[PDB]
């Protein structure tokens, strides 16, 4: 609610219609408007349970109300809102086959890629049929951790708990599996505006920017950014120019195109890591310069706000400070994951044993 200097929306809109004022000023004002209306999301719309804990989340890119989610026990759910047709389910071993990475297929929306603790990077349908296994550990106590895909390049990529990343085509053709790190890789991600430089994060207190076509020589990498603590995720923006990274103790950093090494800014925020808790992953908003993250208080962290609850915090990217706080009782669990729709009208949250939807207010005639 509390917001900084800004005014004259209809004025700015007409000035844009005249060509006087540039578009980004309007974009700033409307980012402010979106946060303002986000302060009226307070009425939590929907809750959804199933069995063992949620571990990974993904949005159907084309459709707003549908979402896919993967559990701690190999349990996948596909769920649509306003349908009430008893959502789609598939079970797994339930104990040690925790899926941990999940993105939709841009081609066949009723498919999905997945990375499992069983040691099986697979591509499987929501109907149960395993389409194709992509890799394998072939030795237990060695499993996969990370996964992503790109369509413009037609590439698939996935990371391990030991330090090596794999890169395949949609029809196999594996020319990769060189080692990148010495320990587990939490997240990996591809650029949207270009197609052939990559980002990876790990427990090594380092996050790495790669050139997936040019480097082949066992740590002849392109760039390496250090950290004070491990990193749970490093995710690109949709514009491709601002890279977000998130630690385990208390930090977020924004790196630019210009000198990947040096940082533009650091966004301190506590999301302290824990064993049985699902690891925390900050995320962009696809069409603004906002960031949305879940909080996990630490009594020792120097809080700027005087009220410290298990809240969902939102920030502006290119400034550093906050603009909104989501909270709803009956949901005092801790939203490990939070992801806005690529559409831009709906938000999904993953708490322990719960999936939540935070949509906007329904008005009265």
């Amino acid at each position: 609610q509390i917001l900084p200097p800004c005014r004259s929306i209809v004025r700015t809109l007409h000035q844009h219609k005249l060509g006087r004022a540039s578009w980004p000023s309007v974009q700033q004002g409307l980012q402010q408007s979106f946060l303002h209306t986000l302060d009226s999301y307070r009425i939590l719309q929907k809750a959804a349970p199933f069995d063992r804990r949620a571990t990974s989340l993904a949005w159907h890119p084309t459709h707003p109300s549908t979402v896919a989610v993967g559990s701690k026990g190999g349990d996948i759910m596909l769920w649509n809102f306003g349908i009430k047709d008893k959502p789609t389910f598939i079970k797994g071993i339930g104990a040690g086959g925790s899926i941990t990475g999940l993105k939709f297929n841009p081609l066949n929306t009723n498919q999905f890629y997945a990375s499992s603790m069983e040691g099986t990077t697979r591509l499987q349908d929501f109907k149960g049929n395993i389409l194709r296994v992509f890799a394998s550990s072939d030795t237990i106590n060695i499993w996969f951790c990370s996964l992503d895909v790109s369509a413009s390049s037609r590439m698939v990529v996935t990371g391990d708990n030991v330090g090596n990343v794999i890169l395949l085509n949609m029809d196999g053709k594996e020319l990769w599996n060189l080692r990148m790190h010495k320990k587990k890789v939490t997240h990996v991600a591809l650029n949207p505006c270009c197609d052939w430089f990559l980002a990876t994060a790990s427990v090594d207190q380092t996050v790495k920017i790669w050139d997936l076509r040019q480097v082949r020589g066992k740590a002849s990498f392109l760039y390496s950014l250090p950290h004070r603590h491990p990193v749970n995720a490093a995710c690109f923006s949709p514009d491709g120019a601002r890279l977000l990274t998130t630690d385990q103790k208390s930090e977020i950093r924004v790196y630019s195109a210009s000198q990947w090494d040096c940082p533009l800014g650091l966004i301190p925020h506590p999301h302290r890591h824990f064993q049985h808790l699902t690891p925390i992953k900050a995320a962009w908003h696809p069409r603004y310069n906002l960031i949305v993250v879940g909080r996990y208080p630490d009594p020792n962290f120097k809080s700027c706000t005087p009220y410290e609850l298990r809240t969902i915090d939102v920030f502006d990217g290119n400034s550093g400070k906050m603009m909104c706080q989501l909270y709803d009782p009956e949901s005092s669990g801790i939203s490990s994951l939070n992801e806005f729709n690529p559409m831009g009208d709906t938000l999904a949250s993953a708490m322990g044993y719960h999936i939540l939807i935070w949509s906007q207010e329904e008005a009265r005639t």
Binding site: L3, C6, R7, S8, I9, V10, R11, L13, H14, H16, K17, L18, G19, R20, S22, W23, P24, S25, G29, L30, Q32, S33, H36, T37, T62, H63, P64, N191, P192, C193, C194, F197, P238, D239, G240, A241, R242, S256, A257, S258, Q259, L264, P286, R287, P342, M343, G344, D345, E362, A363, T365
Partner: protein
């Protein structure tokens, strides 16, 4: 499955840039003018301009500067596009044939980057050692001017200062040196850097950084013998050069921001300055002599010359003549006299050049003859604002100056007049309310009225207003269709903006009313929380208040709907009926919106344009009196306008200057699939579309069966460009697409830019080739190429003339096709 054809009817008129130099020959004085895709080249005369050439580029000219490398007998021309196409061009004339030959071209786009807030900046060192470009924060792109740099390869230098206000190359430096003003939490400051090519880095500039005025906004690099730089701000003007420091604070400049400058004397001794209110000033440099023979700046003085259109740019030509290039008003040629007239102005207008832009709204009416449509456009902005009346038989344009800003227009046949929403600027008076700065249509009407609806003042609060805050005062004007005299003016409430207007009949009532939607405006509100629907009746030369309805939000759009009134207020759509007692009564509501700006109708279907969520198709359900959601465009797009081509085809325009066409999913077997519109057409227009409207300018040959085009939708743009969109069958689309490819292999692109790249769908999020759209301008370009090359275009081309069997196409066949196509606008 949707195939459309789009063509320009009136090229853009707004001026984006202007420069002077010696381009066509060392002896010629040339003026170059940029209107957003068009480059016009004139010769300067004692009396004015001789037109020499007009070209289109496959690109938006963003930078245009002339330069003369060593060893060249005449200047070369550097141009940069918004898609980051850089090119160096040379003028070549032989006989009556003039062609611009490509000496250099290359794409300076980065693999990644965010375009900057103050936009693209491009500058060229006075000694032609390098070109500098500011595209992204934190970077400075350098194109070295080597003879071998035909690909215009470049290197990046980090810039520590991320928020740059302005930058220029300095004169009189023995190495290339930049001077620029930037913003940081400490304020605004000015700094310099030398540019080392061999290190590919900045080096320390010759003189230290200085703090400058908080609104320091423009930098001018001063040539020798003065050297140094002038920094222009909102409240102060400073000059800095090494140990030299001189500042002035003339009160005169406080009323309006200086936004453009121009060098009068090659040695820098005088400048012209233009402000946001169109005032034109002289800036005079006083010399101070020194024993060593150099000359430094002793003092600066400013003298008001007069008033012009609000100038985007200025160029002094010669003999006291100045060209004033405007995007907001008509461009001008003015004459500078040494002595003033009776009122104290030194400016006299010589020539006026039409500007249609900004086109914020327009409508088609058969003013004179049935079937002969004429366009009436809301044109211009502030004191330069106008109506423009355009008719065929190429085109005759009548200008009606309004001296204020129009917003919407509709025609009310039964009263034989037009209603126009307008707004003027007022400032605080000495002791009272507010006062206008000059007379205008709303202040020069035949009759006047004042409001009395006190529903607005619900918990009014006193706000302290600093001295001289400007305000927008909105009015409804009643205008004679024949004489365009101001028949009536109705002033709305203070701080209330009127945004939408319709003239229509309602219910079973045979009277016609003017309906206006408004919003109460306070500075601190992120969105409006209160507004009005106001129903007026026009008779006996005045508006009479018929009805009012108060709502809690801004009424973006309204339309008559089967005798009912549909309205969009921020995130809601409401439907009102007009009762026997002359009030609006709600039938039903729809709620699932972010911000519903744009509405259009056909039958019982409604196309909703969102601020940020591209377009939505709703249907009114007459047998239950509520809405059903039919389909939605699930691709996010920041809309600027929408339009219904027909029951099955839906047009949209987005901030990245692209158009798209959506359809229902015909191959859908489920409600979920049926609810998804598919973006089946895409096209980079290169313009900002504010308004579509149904109508046509060309005389309709009633019953003209078997023409290529179907439907007719005109649209208006900020730059004054007017275009037409129409629908096409599949076969004609295939024919004309093959024609596009063949022509594109033939046409010489200035800067060697590919046409597909130019017309390619392009945003910061995605770049895709165009689809479903024919570039009518490209097709029209067939007629100006030589006949052998026309035969080349149709070489090995299979063609079906009329209805029959396919055969080889001849050049004459395609000449006839394109000639027939030219008559649609």
């Amino acid at each position: 499955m949707s195939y459309n054809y789009v063509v320009t009817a009136q090229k853009p008129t707004a001026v984006n840039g202007c420069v002077t130099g010696h381009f066509t020959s060392a002896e010629d004085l040339n003026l170059l003018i940029a209107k957003n895709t068009r480059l016009e080249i004139y010769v300067v005369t004692a009396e004015g301009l001789r037109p020499v050439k007009e070209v289109g580029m496959y690109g938006k000219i963003a930078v245009m500067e002339l330069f003369r490398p060593k060893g060249e007998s005449k200047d070369l021309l550097f141009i940069l596009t918004a898609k980051y196409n850089a090119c160096i061009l040379e003028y070549k004339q032989s006989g009556e044939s003039i062609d611009i030959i490509t000496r250099a071209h290359g794409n300076v786009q980065d693999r990644i980057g965010r375009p900057s807030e103050t936009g693209i900046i491009g500058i060229i060192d006075p000694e032609c050692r390098m070109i500098g470009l500011r595209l992204y924060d934190g970077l400075f792109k350098v194109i070295p001017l080597d003879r071998d740099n035909k690909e215009l390869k470049a290197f990046n230098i980090r810039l520590e200062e991320l928020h740059v206000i302005d930058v220029k190359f300095l004169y009189g430096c023995q190495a290339p040196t930049i001077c620029f003003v930037y913003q940081d939490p400490q304020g605004r400051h000015v700094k310099t850097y030398e540019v080392s090519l061999r290190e590919k880095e900045f080096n320390k500039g010759p003189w230290k950084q200085e703090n400058v005025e908080a609104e320091a906004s423009m930098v001018i690099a001063v040539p020798e013998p003065f050297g140094g730089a002038i920094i222009i701000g909102q409240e102060s003007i400073t000059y800095h050069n090494g140990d030299k420091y001189l500042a002035i604070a003339p009160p005169i400049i406080k009323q309006s921001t200086i936004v453009c400058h121009n060098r009068v004397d090659p040695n820098g001794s005088r400048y012209l300055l233009g402000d946001m209110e169109g005032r034109l000033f002289m800036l005079l440099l006083e010399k101070e002599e020194q024993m060593d023979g150099t000359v430094t700046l002793k003092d600066l003085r400013v003298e008001l010359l007069g008033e012009t259109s609000i100038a985007e740019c200025l160029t002094y030509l010669d003999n006291g003549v100045v060209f004033v290039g405007s995007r907001l008003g008509d461009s001008q040629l003015v004459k500078l006299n040494v002595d003033s007239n009776e009122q104290g102005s030194y400016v006299v207008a010589m020539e006026t050049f039409t500007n249609l832009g900004p086109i914020v709204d327009m409508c088609v009416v058969d003013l004179e003859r049935q079937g002969q449509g004429q366009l009436v456009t809301c044109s211009g902005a502030f004191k330069e604002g106008s109506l423009r009346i355009i008719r065929n038989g190429k085109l005759h344009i009548r200008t009606v100056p309004l001296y204020e800003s129009p917003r919407k227009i509709c025609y009310q046949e039964v009263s034989q007049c037009f209603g126009v929403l307008s707004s003027r600027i007022e400032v605080q008076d000495t002791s009272g309310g507010t006062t206008a700065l000059r007379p205008s249509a709303s202040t020069q009407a035949l009759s006047s009225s004042v409001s009395s609806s006190k529903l607005f003042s619900s918990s009014t609060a006193p706000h302290e207003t600093s001295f001289g805050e400007e305000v927008e005062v909105h009015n409804l004007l009643i205008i004679d269709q024949h004489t365009f005299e101001v028949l009536h003016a109705h002033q709305f409430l203070q701080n209330e903006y009127a945004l939408s207007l319709v003239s229509c009949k309602l219910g079973k009532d045979p009277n016609t009313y003017f309906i206006v939607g408004t919003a109460m405006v306070y500075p601190e509100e992120a969105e409006p929380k209160q507004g009005r629907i106001v129903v007026f009746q026009y008779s006996d030369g005045k508006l009479q208040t018929v009805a009012e309805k108060e709502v809690k939000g801004a009424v973006y759009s309204m339309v008559e709907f089967n005798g009912k009134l549909l309205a969009s207020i921020n995130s809601t759509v409401r439907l009102y009926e007009w009762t026997t007692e002359k009030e609006l009564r709600t039938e039903c509501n729809h709620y699932n919106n972010i911000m519903a700006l744009y509405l259009k109708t056909k039958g019982d279907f409604i196309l909703v344009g969102d601020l940020m969520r591209s377009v939505l198709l709703l249907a009114y359900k007459p047998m239950e009196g509520n809405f059903e959601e039919i389909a939605r465009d699930f691709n996010p797009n920041w809309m600027s306008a929408v339009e219904i081509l027909d029951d099955d085809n839906f047009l949209g325009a987005e901030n990245a200057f692209n158009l798209f066409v959506c359809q229902k999913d015909s191959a859908a077997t489920t409600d979920e699939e049926r609810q998804h519109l598919q973006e089946v057409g895409l096209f980079h227009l290169g313009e900002f579309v504010n308004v579509f409207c149904h109508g046509s300018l060309v005389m309709q040959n009633l019953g003209e069966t078997s023409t290529p085009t179907q439907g007719s939708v005109l649209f208006g743009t900020v730059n004054g460009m007017i275009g037409l969109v129409t629908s096409l069958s599949e076969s004609w689309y295939n024919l004309l697409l093959d024609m596009q490819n063949r022509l594109n292999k033939v046409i010489k692109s200035v800067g060697k830019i590919e046409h597909s790249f130019w017309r390619s769908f392009h945003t910061e999020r995605k770049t895709e080739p165009a689809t479903g759209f024919i570039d009518g301008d490209l097709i029209e370009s067939f007629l100006d190429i030589s006949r052998p090359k026309m035969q080349e275009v149709v070489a090995n081309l299979q063609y079906d003339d009329g209805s029959g069997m396919k055969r080889e196409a001849t050049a004459d066949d395609l000449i006839k096709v394109v000639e027939e196509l030219t008559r649609i606008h």
